[PDB]
């Protein structure tokens, strides 16, 4: 199962050639393409539940597309070739290539509501989370558990007009903020890894990114909590007549409930978790993380690829 | 004089409490204050040549202020408490706290003109620059002298409307661009250090920032070329009235001329060279670089600061 | 087939509990057992070509034993549970757990003779070796082809009475020696990897160890040359009776000939390549290398093993 | 005061040229020589209390030799150009170049007894140490504090016939052992640093090395305890009529009692704390640690020295 790392390795190597060239679609589509090629060489029966979208506007890794050898139990397949293609195109930090796999039918439905509100923290402080409490009370309880003062805390938040109130409320408590322009899968995993410089992720981001992060959290530990975030009353009603209680707090296991979860990622640009891909004459080096829920084993994998063998 | 790193460590630690708090002046002010206190306890006599500004719009580290306990040969002093207070106040990457020292009277005057066109590269390509040439020609010349493909080169550039043509021209060359929103001292240093991922810095930034980057380039090797870049005709005459040859190409040694040059910097937020201030139960870590032109020795310094108490908190691991 | 790294991780973790406990056979036995269990759950069909020994003096991983769940193309299997049980049992540096796999019938027979004279180097100097020449000549040839000074070269050598002349000759050359007390699979790999600090391995060690080192060198690049080294006339005829040309120079591909070669290793104690097993409240870390000749891809793998429970212990940081 | 790192940098660079050349005295004396040259360029008034020995058999850094500029308060100077010159000469790991400085008269007398029995552990478990208890009880109490099982513990012990009983007793408890052929300054500092792989140092080693280690422990935290270890009844009587209670447990502050302690070290060969010196065409890189008791600041310093500037 470790062999699934070659999928994000291939995605990151493809996107790595487009880093800093200012073409979002070029790099994104090249990563999609390398990953779809490599996943269909892998001994698995998978169905894309999270990918590039519906087949009418996404030719590759559309929702429902079957992937893999064809061998093995059919399972849920979530893929994010680049978590924030703009970071890749501008040469910014913390762009990652991501993939998760769970038991079929155990990944929360990514299409119910576009956005969800999120909070995430690592294993030491996971027990104190309450996304219905004000962010200030989450910060103080998390800080006390970590033996930090509140002014030592660092909260990762997407830089968005919608987060003006949240940003104001975090600042009022005294904690530092790490504003990111994109990439709250990376932000969420960083909140849960030790000595990353990020102690907490908060705010609204993509529902599919919330499920991908939960897959990671299932394997490495920590918690994410979420609540669906209808944009308008239309999506609010669509959600209610799909069956959802909007007072409902989703825990990690509500987003990904399988017993067999797999997650891996490979760095595209340098981030606070993974170094970006580096190209050399002889080849190139990728930096990846790989993890499984059943063992709880976490692997850091640095790979030196030899494409050719020069004079 | 490794002790001067404590100036940037103090400035970074002070600014660390303001990261992401959306108050650029609070953070600068905190950094300014901490650096001034620490600099007046070191055994240098210095005059602030590059600082906050002039005696009236800047209450601390103003141009001309004396710094240091009192003893030592009088020397030129340059400090940038945060290179890009906005990276600090939003919690974005590559904010650093910067200090440079050089022999007295050896630093280019930073009030000549506000802005300066720049191009900087590391030692491998240091004799190949021509800032009067178009960027395409510079990229090609630097690529060939490093036996690299143009499509493999990365240019660091400030993301500004004034750089629409420069950015287009780098891209049409086939080179890559790392777009920064602020911080071309850090970008200049990143270009000059060998295995950084950045081959080149180009574009118009602040004149004081250009001179500080020159001090670092003096110690670590490489070159920067620059020209003054007046913003309108009033400034062009303001400069010309002062005797400036607005066609002169300024080199590294034009900006900082002495043979005793010192540079150090400390990470405020995480960057491509220095990690930012990291907080722990017992204290914090800072990540600094210290450089000296006389010897050419470069030092990467990682420090744990106990805030405070002698083993009442667990031990912390580094790097 | 990255899954095979779990074989050496299991062997290292088992041996980890015996480090410094002064019981070489307990540690080997623990490692042997753990590797056999884990290897029989992977999807290979293999025959043990290099293992503990013959069916009667070795109860587990004996020569000829079949391994793997049952499916897969039959292939050659080499395992060294600890390369130097004595480094393990005293808690000294550079103990590793080793596995190699190659196409069936492609591994040199390890019972031909117990010992083998060896010299190994990385890809830069791979065509310059001559094991029939004196070491002085080899050191000089390797130095020149890497544009290095002889006085800068480092030779890894087993500390043995039988190596008094070899050691003297390296020293008189002006080269350096890293003296190891055991472990010339690790020494061979250290010589072959580029920026390791070791330029060369030389001397007589075990024949099975030479073949395992060849499998790694097949994947990562470089060369080993060897000759069989009988310990007395009885063994010389024992070899010669078997059809061995005791004057043949064996190369890398003589020892391991297939085109599908796999090698992986895991640190038991801390070494110049792999960290040893490290223990934590929630579990342990292992440090492995995995290599494949077909693609030439080299993987450094750091793993945290939860022993056990899902977030009941603090998070651990790596590398 | 950080400028004192250049003394161990110079010692390690000098010894670094002799690494792996099989000449103990060559490398040792070259390190002594580089360090004595560089210390006399430093603004300090110092007197060698720990060095190469008495002046009749040690020309440089003998006991009582005055070192430094001559400027500043006179202080205690302890130096160990290489902690185990055999490691340097054979190309073995964990050879370090070491220097400590304290207030004059505050370093315990290195010449009273040749050997002392030692135990050392880091800041988290320092409070449980009792060198008069059996080693097994120290191991279990240290393990419990660290939240480790006893089989997770690793004890550093000098490989010596005198330690046969200790080695047997540690093995009987179930803990692992890291046997070192030389260098229990390095062993002691490693026991006190986190994530070094060593959790405890135990056994008898040189009294001067015990005082140098205590200097380090004064700055970084942890504890060392010691008891003098007379070889014979002669040294036992010499110690008694010098005034020493041999039932006395020496704590860290009994070995180095100043309020102003400084300690630094530079790696000679690669160790579990510091990388060894690496030589390049342009120059060389040293790896050092520097620490002060009054602030408790610990610095890791990687230096890239440019001796020349080639074609
Ligand atoms: O850009 P939006 O619409 O605010 O949505 C945020 C989402 O976009 C991304 O930044 C990139 O697609 C995700 O990481 C994040 O969840
Ligand atoms: O922000 P401006 O006015 O375009 O000028 C750029 C200057 O500002 C900074 O980004 C920070 O003040 C400097 O690094 C740079 O020299
Ligand atoms: O110990 P001997 O008999 O000299 O042979 C050396 C062999 O022993 C080992 O050191 C460990 O058994 C091997 O690495 C090496 O091949
Ligand atoms: O070699 P001995 O006499 O047992 O003494 C041990 C001492 O020798 C050293 O290994 C090197 O001088 C010290 O680290 C240690 O304290
Ligand atoms: Mg995304
Ligand atoms: Mg600035
Ligand atoms: Mg560079
Ligand atoms: Mg062996
Ligand atoms: Mg090598
Ligand atoms: Mg010593």
Q: What is the DSSP string of B4-36?
A: GHHHHHHHHHHHHTTTTSS-HHHHHHHHHHHHH
Rounded-to-integer distance, Cα D204 and Cα C218, Å: 47
Return the percent helix, strand and coil in chain A, to nearest 5: 35, 30, 40
Q: In 3D, which of C317, C318, C283 has the Cα closest to residue C300? A: C318
According to DSSP, the residues that pair with D178 across neighbouring strands are D156
Which residue reads 């043949």 in tokens? C248
Q: Where are the beta strands (DSSP E) in B73-161?
A: 74-80, 96-103, 115-121, 154-158
Q: Using DSSP, how many helices (H) and how many strands (E) does chain B show?
A: 9, 13
Rounded-to-integer distance, Cα D198 and Cα D188, Å: 9
Rounded-to-integer distance, Cα B93 and Cα B90, Å: 9
Rounded-to-integer distance, Cα D8 and Cα A278, Å: 35
Q: In 3D, which of A259, A269, A125 has the Cα closest to residue A183? A: A269
Residues near C73 by Cβ (< 8 Å), separated by ≥ 6? C45, C103, C104
Q: In 3D, which of C159, C193, C171, C145 has the Cα closest to residue C300? A: C193
Q: Where are the beta strands (DSSP E) in chain D?
A: 45-50, 66-67, 74-80, 96-103, 115-121, 154-158, 176-180, 200-206, 223-229, 262-267, 278-279, 283-292, 298-306
Q: Which two three-digit tokens encode residue A151?
A: 């002014």
Are D156 and D118 contacting, i.e. CB atoms less than 8 angstroms apart? Answer: no
Rounded-to-integer distance, Cα C303 and Cα C318, Å: 9
Q: What is the CA radius of gyration of chain D?
A: 19
- From the alpha carbon of C187, which atom of ligand 3 is closest? 14
The per-residue b/e assignment along D15-26, b for 16 or more CB within 10 angstroms, e otherwise, is bbbbbbbbebeb
Residue B244, judged by CB atoms within 10 A of its CB (0-12, 13-18, 19+), counts as: middle
With an 8 Å Cβ cutoff, are C295 and A306 in contact? yes
With an 8 Å Cβ cutoff, are D91 and C176 in contact? yes
CA B56-B58-B62 angle, to 5 degrees, is: 95
- The DSSP letter of residue B55 is T
Q: What domains sit in chain B, N to C, each tagged with a CATH number?
A: 1-104+260-319 (3.30.540.10), 105-259 (3.40.190.90)
A202, A234, B174, C161 from A231: Cα distances, Å = 18, 8, 41, 80
Q: Which residues line ligand 1 (CB under 6 A)?
A: A 83-84, 158, 160, 182-185, 205-206, 209
Which residue reads 């501008």 in tokens? A90
- By Cβ distance, the residue of D220, D297, D306 closest to B303 is D297
Are D68 and D44 contacting, i.e. CB atoms less than 8 angstroms apart? Answer: yes
Q: What is the CA radius of gyration of chain B?
A: 19
With an 8 Å Cβ cutoff, are B298 and D304 in contact? yes
Q: Classify the phi-psi angles of A90: left when phi > 0, otherwise alpha if psi is within -120 to 50, otherwise beta.
A: alpha
Side-chain half-sphere exposure of D98, counting CA atoms within 13 A: 31
Residues near A54 by Cβ (< 8 Å), separated by ≥ 6? A62, A63
Rounded-to-integer distance, Cα A195 and Cα A201, Å: 15
Are D207 and D228 contacting, i.e. CB atoms less than 8 angstroms apart? Answer: yes
- Nearest residue in A to B148, CA atom: A281
Hey, is D32 helix, strand or coil? helix
Q: State residue B42 phi and psi, 5-degree precision.
A: -90, 155
Pocket test for ligand 4, best of D79, D182, D185, D212 (most atoms within 8 A of CB): D182
According to DSSP, the residues that pair with B117 across neighbouring strands are B204, B227
Rounded-to-integer distance, Cα C182 and Cα B182, Å: 55
Pocket test for ligand 3, best of C85, C98, C188, C209 (most atoms within 8 A of CB): C209
A23, C11, C95 from C23: Cα distances, Å = 61, 16, 15
Element (H, E) at D233: helix D233-240
Are D197 and C269 contacting, i.e. CB atoms less than 8 angstroms apart? Answer: no
Among C222, C290, C299, which would you mutate to test the A interface (most chain A Cβ atoms within 10 Å of its Cβ)? C299
Q: Which two three-digit tokens encode residue D25?
A: 């005295």
Rounded-to-integer distance, Cα A255 and Cα A213, Å: 9
Is the CA virtual torsion B202, B205, B207, B212 positive or negative?
Answer: negative
Rounded-to-integer distance, Cα D271 and Cα D198, Å: 12
Q: State residue A210 phi and psi, 5-degree precision.
A: -65, -40
Is the link from the previous residue into C308 a cis peptide, with omega within 30 of 0? yes
Is the link from the previous residue into A177 a cis peptide, with omega within 30 of 0? no
Residue B259, judged by CB atoms within 10 A of its CB (0-12, 13-18, 19+), counts as: exposed
Residue D31, number of CB atoms within 10 A of its CB = 28
Rounded-to-integer distance, Cα B80 and Cα C118, Å: 59
Dihedral of CA atoms A154, A158, A162, A164 in degrees, nearest 10, equals 30
Rounded-to-integer distance, Cα A87 and Cα A65, Å: 27
C17, C18, D291 from D142: Cα distances, Å = 18, 20, 25
Rounded-to-integer distance, Cα C12 and Cα C270, Å: 12
Which residue reads 């059809």 in tokens? C243
Q: In 3D, which of A308, A301, A306 has the Cα closest to residue A275? A: A301
CA B124-B129-B135 angle, to 5 degrees, is: 115
Q: In 3D, which of D87, D107, D104, D111 has the Cα closest to residue D31? A: D87
Residue B42, number of CB atoms within 10 A of its CB = 17
Are A209 and A182 contacting, i.e. CB atoms less than 8 angstroms apart? Answer: no
Q: In 3D, which of C212, C182, C213, C206 has the Cα closest to residue C87? A: C182
Hey, is D305 helix, strand or coil? strand
With an 8 Å Cβ cutoff, are C21 and D177 in contact? yes
Residue D244, judged by CB atoms within 10 A of its CB (0-12, 13-18, 19+), counts as: middle
With an 8 Å Cβ cutoff, are A300 and C305 in contact? no
Counting every residue written for chain B, the total comes to: 319
Q: What is the CA radius of gyration of chain A?
A: 19
Residues near A108 by Cβ (< 8 Å), separated by ≥ 6? A207, A211, A214, A250, A254, A255, A256
Rounded-to-integer distance, Cα B29 and Cα B81, Å: 9
Dihedral of CA atoms D26, D31, D33, D34 in degrees, nearest 10, equals 130
Q: Which two three-digit tokens encode residue D57?
A: 């058999």
DSSP H helices in B83-134 = 85-90
With an 8 Å Cβ cutoff, are B299 and D296 in contact? no
Counting every residue written for chain A, the total comes to: 311
Rounded-to-integer distance, Cα C207 and Cα D95, Å: 33
Rounded-to-integer distance, Cα C293 and Cα C309, Å: 37
Chains contacting C with at least 3 CB pairs below 8 Å?
Answer: A, D
The per-residue b/e assignment along B198-211, b for 16 or more CB within 10 angstroms, e otherwise, is bbbbbbbbbbbbbb
Side-chain half-sphere exposure of B109, counting CA atoms within 13 A: 9
Q: Which two three-digit tokens encode residue C86?
A: 């004595």
Q: Which two three-digit tokens encode residue C291?
A: 């290599």
Rounded-to-integer distance, Cα B153 and Cα B135, Å: 12
Hey, is D88 helix, strand or coil? helix
Counting every residue written for chain D, the total comes to: 311
DSSP H helices in chain B = 5-16, 24-39, 85-90, 135-145, 164-173, 184-192, 207-220, 233-241, 252-255
Experimental method: X-ray
Question: Residue whose CA is closest, atom 5 of ligand 2?
Answer: B205
Q: State residue A177 phi and psi, 5-degree precision.
A: -130, 140
Beta strands D200-206 and D115-121, pairing class: antiparallel
Residues near D285 by Cβ (< 8 Å), separated by ≥ 6? D275, D277, D278, D302, D303, D304, D305
Helix axes D164-173, D135-146, angle to 10 degrees: 40
Q: Which two three-digit tokens encode residue D208?
A: 């001067």
Q: Which two three-digit tokens encode residue D55?
A: 């002046």
According to DSSP, the residues that pair with C283 across neighbouring strands are C280, C306
Cβ of residue D276 lying under 6 Å from some atom of ligand 4: no
Are D114 and D234 contacting, i.e. CB atoms less than 8 angstroms apart? Answer: no
Residues of chain D found within 8 Å of residue B314, distances taken between Cβ atoms:
123-124, 194
Rounded-to-integer distance, Cα C167 and Cα C150, Å: 15
Q: Which two three-digit tokens encode residue B233?
A: 């005709």
Rounded-to-integer distance, Cα B38 and Cα C292, Å: 55
Residue D122, judged by CB atoms within 10 A of its CB (0-12, 13-18, 19+), counts as: buried
Rounded-to-integer distance, Cα C84 and Cα C87, Å: 6
- By Cβ distance, the residue of D283, D295, D303 closest to B306 is D295
Chains contacting B with at least 3 CB pairs below 8 Å?
Answer: A, D
Q: Which two three-digit tokens encode residue D9?
A: 């940098």
Are B296 and A161 contacting, i.e. CB atoms less than 8 angstroms apart? Answer: no
Q: Which two three-digit tokens encode residue B274?
A: 């220095």
Are C197 and C154 contacting, i.e. CB atoms less than 8 angstroms apart? Answer: yes
Q: What is the CA radius of gyration of chain C?
A: 19
Rounded-to-integer distance, Cα B167 and Cα C15, Å: 58
- By Cβ distance, the residue of D122, D301, D304 closest to B315 is D122
Q: State residue B117 phi and psi, 5-degree precision.
A: -80, 140
Residues near C241 by Cβ (< 8 Å), separated by ≥ 6? none
Residues of chain B found within 8 Å of residue A195, distances taken between Cβ atoms:
278
């Amino acid at each position: 199962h470790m062999e699934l790392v070659r999928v994000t390795e291939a995605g990151a190597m493809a996107a790595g050639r487009w880093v800093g060239r200012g073409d979002k679609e070029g790099g994104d589509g090249a990563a999609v393409d390398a990953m779809r090629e490599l996943v269909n060489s892998v001994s698995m029966r998978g169905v894309v539940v999270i990918g590039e979208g519906e087949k009418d506007h996404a030719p590759m890794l559309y929702n429902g597309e079957e992937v893999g050898n064809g061998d093995g139990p059919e399972c849920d397949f979530a893929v994010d070739p680049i978590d924030g293609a703009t970071l890749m195109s501008k040469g910014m930090t913390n762009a990652i290539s991501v993939l998760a796999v769970a038991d079929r039918g155990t990944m929360f439905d990514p299409s119910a509501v576009f956005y969800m509100n999120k909070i995430a923290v690592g294993p030491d402080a996971a027990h104190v989370l309450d996304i219905t409490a004000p962010i200030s009370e989450n910060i103080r309880a998390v800080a006390k558990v970590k033996d930090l003062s509140v002014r030592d805390m660092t909260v990762c938040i997407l830089d968005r007009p919608r987060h003006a109130q949240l940003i104001h409320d975090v600042r009022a408590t005294g904690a530092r903020i790490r504003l990111i322009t994109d990439g709250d899968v990376a932000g969420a995993i960083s909140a849960c890894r030790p000595h990353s410089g990020t102690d907490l992720l908060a705010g609204i981001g993509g529902t599919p990114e919330g499920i991908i992060a939960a897959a990671a959290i299932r394997c490495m530990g920590g918690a994410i909590q979420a609540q669906l975030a209808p944009r308008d009353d239309a999506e609010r009603r669509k959600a209610l007549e799909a069956g959802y209680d909007l007072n409902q707090v989703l825990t990690t296991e509500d987003l990904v409930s399988g017993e067999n979860v797999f997650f891996c990622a490979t760095g595209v640009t340098d981030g606070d978790l993974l170094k970006g891909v580096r190209y050399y004459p002889g080849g190139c080096t990728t930096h990846s993380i790989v993890m499984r829920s059943k063992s709880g084993t976490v692997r850091m994998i640095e790979a030196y690829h030899r494409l050719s063998k020069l004079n």
